[PDB]
Design a protein that fits this description.
The structure is a homodimer of 213-residue chains. Chain A is of the alpha+beta class and 213 residues long. Helices cover 30% and strands 24% of the residues of chain A. The longest helix of chain A has 20 residues. The termini of chain A are far apart. The complex binds adenosine-5'-diphosphate (2 copies). Chains A, B: Homodimer. Interacts with the co-chaperones AHA1, CDC37, CNS1, CPR6, CPR7, HCH1, SBA1, SSE1 and STI1. CNS1, CPR6, CPR7 and STI1. Interacts directly with the substrates GCN2, HAP1 and STE11.
């Protein structure tokens, strides 16, 4: 059974603002999610300095992007620290985020939407290209859980009994908007990645599917 | 909870014979599994002639090969008819297979191991390159289940609560032997596929993972 939680009011406002904005540089969402992925990998690496066993659940440290055309889904995965059930509820919704209102006010003043990451709310930039998202996470400290949101005022968290097992890490499963399907294309994904992410310490793997000739 | 079943005696013998054989043309396993995949796709397509709704669980008809290096696993997937729990138990183990003893006798006489498919036991050719296998299947008529074998005399069947959801079809998850890791390599997989499978009516998709430069 899934559990439902209410988003902190300002986060709901931010999501409404982002999913509805006609901003032109929507591709910035990838830079933000890749940055969050890198941060998660930094955390597990750092924790492992004094607790090496933490790495054993998934020795490979990577960022992986997997387009799923049929389902019109784009997945951004990392083998970082991951999030326990409590962290998913805490970090992605119920607790007030310092930069939320600040960013919205900056936006009103004319600030570029690309500043979202500097305000600490880059995760929500995903709503620039997706109308729904499932965050699948496995922290060494908990079971695998699924957090899901459609930019509405509430989200759900469910023990994961339906997705592939993640050794450790997080998968941002984006259900792309009908007019943003270009982010399923290899060429497009490649140019966006090369553009705003040259100094990422981890390999960024793109999963490509080709018909054998 | 998993359930354990005993293999029909002759199948156990066949598996022992195959996993231990020093045969040189081990690559034939791919041709056999791709053939079984094509057959499964033929079945759902045919059934759909009088029951079109059967296709809706997964409209795309394909064969997909996905190497998973870290886990030393190679997956062969199809969106065919799939197998219900009863079919997995029935079709892959507990029931006597007509060609089992016949093939073993042919083998003793000098027959090429590649004849395995003509005897109707091509599925077991997978033990030429793997010491363990999980068959994940989803038939429109049942839930998703996992059948698992290590070539021993018994196998297990478990309701699937750990793998990605298959719309419909089957995944042969092969845990490759340490000296057969060449089948994780794109170039190698490509040449084997092009060699013994030119007349397959369905697209054969290879999932490749590359680091973004
Ligand atoms: N890939 C991830 N792995 C682990 N935690 C994440 C991931 N993405 C987001 N989070 C968590 O949820 C929070 C919300 O994301 P975000 O608004 O972008 O925060 P921040 O700007 O501090 O990265 C993060 O602070 C982080 O704790
Ligand atoms: N990919 C698959 N999809 C559905 N059923 C399969 C698949 N692979 C094997 N089977 C089933 O298990 C049986 C055992 O496989 P195999 O020995 O190769 O049989 P056959 O030679 O008749 O294909 C098959 O007859 C078939 O019913």
């Amino acid at each position: 059974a899934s559990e439902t939680f209410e988003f902190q009011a300002e986060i709901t406002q931010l999501m409404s603002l982002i999913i509805n904005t006609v901003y032109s540089n929507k591709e910035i969402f990838l830079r933000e999610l890749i940055s969050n992925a890198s941060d998660a990998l930094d955390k597990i690496r750092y924790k492992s300095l004094s607790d090496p066993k933490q790495l054993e659940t998934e020795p490979d440290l990577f960022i992986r992007i997997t387009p799923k055309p049929e389902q019109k889904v784009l997945e951004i995965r990392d083998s970082g620290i991951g999030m326990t059930k409590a962290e998913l509820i805490n970090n992605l919704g119920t607790i007030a985020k310092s930069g939320t209102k600040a960013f919205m006010e900056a936006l009103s003043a004319g600030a570029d939407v690309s500043m979202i990451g500097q305000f600490g709310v880059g995760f929500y930039s995903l709503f620039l290209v997706a109308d729904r998202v499932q965050v699948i996470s496995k922290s060494n400290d908990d079971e695998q859980y699924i957090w899901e949101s459609n930019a509405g005022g509430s989200f759900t968290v469910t023990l994961d009994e339906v997705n592939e097992r993640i050794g450790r890490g997080t998968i941002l499963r984006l259900f792309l908007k009908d007019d943003q399907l270009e982010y399923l294309e290899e060429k497009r994904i490649k140019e966006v990645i090369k553009r705003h992410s040259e100094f990422v310490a981890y390999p960024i793997q793109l999963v490509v599917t080709k018909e054998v000739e």
